[PDB]
Design a protein around this ligand. Sequence first.
Ligand SMILES: *[C@@H]1O[C@H](CO)[C@@H](O[C@@H]2O[C@H](CO)[C@@H](O[C@@H]3O[C@H](CO)[C@@H](O)[C@H](O)[C@@H]3O)[C@H](O)[C@H]2NC(C)=O)[C@H](O)[C@H]1NC(C)=O
Ligand SMILES: *[C@@H]1O[C@H](CO)[C@@H](O[C@@H]2O[C@H](CO)[C@@H](O[C@@H]3O[C@H](CO)[C@@H](O)[C@H](O)[C@@H]3O)[C@H](O)[C@H]2NC(C)=O)[C@H](O)[C@H]1NC(C)=O
Ligand SMILES: *[C@@H]1O[C@H](CO[C@@H]2O[C@@H](C)[C@@H](O)[C@@H](O)[C@@H]2O)[C@@H](O[C@@H]2O[C@H](CO)[C@@H](O)[C@H](O)[C@H]2NC(C)=O)[C@H](O)[C@H]1NC(C)=O
Lengths: 120, 154, 154, 120, 211, 211
Amino acid sequence: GKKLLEAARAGQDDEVRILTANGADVNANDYWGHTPLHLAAMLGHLEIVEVLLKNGADVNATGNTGRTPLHLAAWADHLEIVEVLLKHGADVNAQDKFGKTAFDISIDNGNEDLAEILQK
Amino acid sequence: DLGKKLLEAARAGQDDEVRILMANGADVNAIDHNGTTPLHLAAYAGHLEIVEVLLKHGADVNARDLRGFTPLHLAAIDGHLEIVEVLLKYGADVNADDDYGTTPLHLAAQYGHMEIVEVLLKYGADVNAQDKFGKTAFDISIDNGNEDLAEILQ
Amino acid sequence: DLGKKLLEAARAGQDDEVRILMANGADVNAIDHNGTTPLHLAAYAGHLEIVEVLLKHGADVNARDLRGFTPLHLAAIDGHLEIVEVLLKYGADVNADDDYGTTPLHLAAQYGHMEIVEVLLKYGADVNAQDKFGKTAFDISIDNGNEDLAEILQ
Amino acid sequence: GKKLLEAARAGQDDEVRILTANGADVNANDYWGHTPLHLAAMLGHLEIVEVLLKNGADVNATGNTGRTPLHLAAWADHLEIVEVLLKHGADVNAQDKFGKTAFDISIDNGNEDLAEILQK
Amino acid sequence: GVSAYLSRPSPFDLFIRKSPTITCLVVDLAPSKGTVNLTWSRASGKPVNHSTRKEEKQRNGTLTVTSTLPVGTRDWIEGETYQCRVTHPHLPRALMRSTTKTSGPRAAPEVYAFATPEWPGSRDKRTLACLIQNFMPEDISVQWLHNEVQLPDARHSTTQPRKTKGSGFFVFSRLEVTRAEWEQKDEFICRAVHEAASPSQTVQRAVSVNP
Amino acid sequence: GVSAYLSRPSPFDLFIRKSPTITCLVVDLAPSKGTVNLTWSRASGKPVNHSTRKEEKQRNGTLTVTSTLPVGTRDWIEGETYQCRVTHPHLPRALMRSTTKTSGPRAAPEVYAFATPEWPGSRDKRTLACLIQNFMPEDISVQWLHNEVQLPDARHSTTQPRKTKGSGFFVFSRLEVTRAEWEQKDEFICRAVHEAASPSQTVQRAVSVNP
Ligand SMILES: *[C@@H]1O[C@H](CO)[C@@H](O[C@@H]2O[C@H](CO)[C@@H](O[C@@H]3O[C@H](CO)[C@@H](O)[C@H](O)[C@@H]3O)[C@H](O)[C@H]2NC(C)=O)[C@H](O)[C@H]1NC(C)=O
Ligand SMILES: *[C@@H]1O[C@H](CO)[C@@H](O[C@@H]2O[C@H](CO)[C@@H](O[C@@H]3O[C@H](CO)[C@@H](O)[C@H](O)[C@@H]3O)[C@H](O)[C@H]2NC(C)=O)[C@H](O)[C@H]1NC(C)=O
Ligand SMILES: *[C@@H]1O[C@H](CO[C@@H]2O[C@@H](C)[C@@H](O)[C@@H](O)[C@@H]2O)[C@@H](O[C@@H]2O[C@H](CO)[C@@H](O)[C@H](O)[C@H]2NC(C)=O)[C@H](O)[C@H]1NC(C)=O
């Protein structure tokens, strides 16, 4: 049931769609506790994040390190995915074990163009 | 032939199919293109029951593939504790070295299998054995971030 | 053997050495690794006077290398007009094809040798000869920019 | 004697120097009546053009087509070689068989930076 | 994301087809409005023949434009330099690429052909390999032949020319063959077209699947 | 004119040395007096180890800075993502490169090795070739072995992984050997380290100069 994880990481879109339809868990979890949505946001696969959203994937799922899919999308400097994820009710003020938001992560990475989206 | 089917049966965990193939005269120490015996695959895949059956039929517990791995190396890599103990009880060499100097203690330290490490040490593992790159299992655990395991290795 | 130095002699142009080697038993139709004969090399390098020595002493005028080149092909490439004549007088296939259907008329058109094409034409060179790519010798001269040559390529 | 022609093309820097000590003709002509200075100017080998200049090659040498080293350096957009040949003195108004100067070439190829060097 | 490339004539086109051409390739990752123009010119100023232009839009959105210009053999081997200029209204400068005959030491290729052993699954197919080595300069054309038939280029894969640290360049070619083919004739030939293979610019080796 | 690259660990470093590392290579073609800084971070936020930094100014005047970060074997195969963020004062915007474990279908390599015949001039030298085909993913390490002794990597050239006309990836390896070497022991082993080769991550093949 976790072929969706590798399919989200690999980014083969139609492969993801067919697995989701068969009922595969959209909230499956890797060694770090991250869903297919985390991997798709982090790896910049916008096309799959929407398919997962259509399947109702938790947009604020917490990894074993307490990182939401939004955190990884900001870490990877993927601008459009972040605003997509925010549009689907993302929690900006969520913090990890470290105590960090996506904003803190753009501050560490020096990405103020995306920090504007989080400021905005 | 029977050796190929036994290797596949030993890898897949096909328990009764290993017995039927050996009843047909399959070499218990048959090897593939890289010297892998069915005991290698059973130890790698974690099939303790097939590991036991193969040993009872004269499987070479110290068989080496073209890299120099014994089944103990493989049981140490995947962290199969009960398979490591049975291999050792049947006379596996805890200090077996590959073509690069890698002992089972090296592999246990690389993958963070603490309880594999304890057993290998109880059976006389050289903490001071270096691979041909000059590194002990202590070094390997440090290089892999297993600092909690490095205290047991010095 | 002696055939090697004959090949080297015929290419370099050492006329007396060719005669000395042939007298000593060297094979007039000796080949290197590509099937190249001394007549090929002498015709390519432009040594009319070795060409005649080899031809009078049993050199195959229509010998082909592994590509399908006869000596006449190489003579047309390097534009050696008198070698073209002597080869034809000794029975050279004027319409000889290489593995790709290339005739001596094709090559003379490629390198713009009008004097050679009309000698070939005089000896019955087929104006319609098509290489395996579907191009006549007229097409080759047009594509290489020798419109002055394509006029007489009928 | 024409081994300097092949070396000017190849850009063999110090080969050229030993070939001039043995006095290879600096005005040897290829199929296009061009000297090793043309070729080094055409292909952008500046050290070479200077040693040919030091050894007394005609900066205003003309090929079959009427083209000087200035023509070929302008055609190839090698801006510095144009300056060097100018500093060592070349006929900027020199035309070719088809009626063109180095400036006309610069206009046809659209290099305003070259055209500005030429009209000053 | 706009890049342009200009190639020399392939040894096959120049020595085998007898029709050497040079091609200017432009790939535009994000094609905006406006026509891409490609213009040719020779260093001597002599006229150029008429070229062929081809355009193709791939799935990702990119435009690929090519112009192929016929060149003369005598022309090319005597060192004529050609130049391609690429222009678009929304590009700041124009792009220029140039090409001329190869330079440097010249060495003929050595060709060696090998055959892989039979495998239980691949009993109907099997792999032929060709080593073409110690050749200078770097331009080489590679061809596989069977039963007096030139195999389609899509059937083999040839590595980019790589320099042995001291003596020449080397390429490798991998070709999968079928049992139907070696049973028809167990002679497969790997031919190279290269400038310095004298006198016919071809070097070849044969291989048999079974001894 | 600054470039940055981030690589996955070599299979040799990960499986043989048991000490995987990733290297951030930054190549500055024209260097200013400002100092480049390379910072490391993991996607999980768990702590990075202490990296090693190297610096060399080449003959063409360019500067190459590399940072090598030790990674955990566990963390790598379980899919951790690592980024390298590069900051230089004269660089307007930061350049970030990322890396993570390979994805897709997994296929074990097939290895074949060949020896060229005795050329008359190459009486004391022979060329050995190695074909490694049909593996996935593309990451692989190639090694040459003689008298139970690893030969240095400088002694052979290995082509870049290319997609087969059929299925998988293929590389070739070229290795010259001396008469003194095969007369001592006429057995040379080509060994590939690849994740999909189970159970030991190595496949190999031997070849002899003398038939
Ligand atoms: C997606 O768009 C890209 C546009 O970049 C298409 O690939 C491009 O195809 C051209 C033609 O092969 C490549 O040119 C080659 O470039 C290499 C160096 O990168 C050069 O050495 C060769 O001589 C040749 O000129 C171009 O680089 C290549 N770009 C890449 C790397 O993707 C691609 O085909 C399109 N994909 C599809 C099928 O939608
Ligand atoms: C002279 O200038 C050239 C520019 O043409 C520079 O060469 C560049 O060298 C770097 C490595 O220092 C190459 O980057 C990387 O190479 C490694 C090889 O392992 C590879 O893993 C990476 O994917 C990447 O290719 C770079 O390709 C290369 N650039 C070119 C255009 O060749 C360098 O400054 C000087 N050359 C040398 C050899 O030092
Ligand atoms: C594309 O350009 C050709 C070439 O004209 C030259 O190209 C410029 C980039 C620059 O190099 C200038 O010197 C020239 O203007 C155009 O071909 C010309 O077309 C006109 C009319 O069709 C004709 O009178 C000229 O003789 C042609 N010149 C040549 C050399 O063929 C062509 O029209 C351009 N196409 C587009 C769409 O712009």
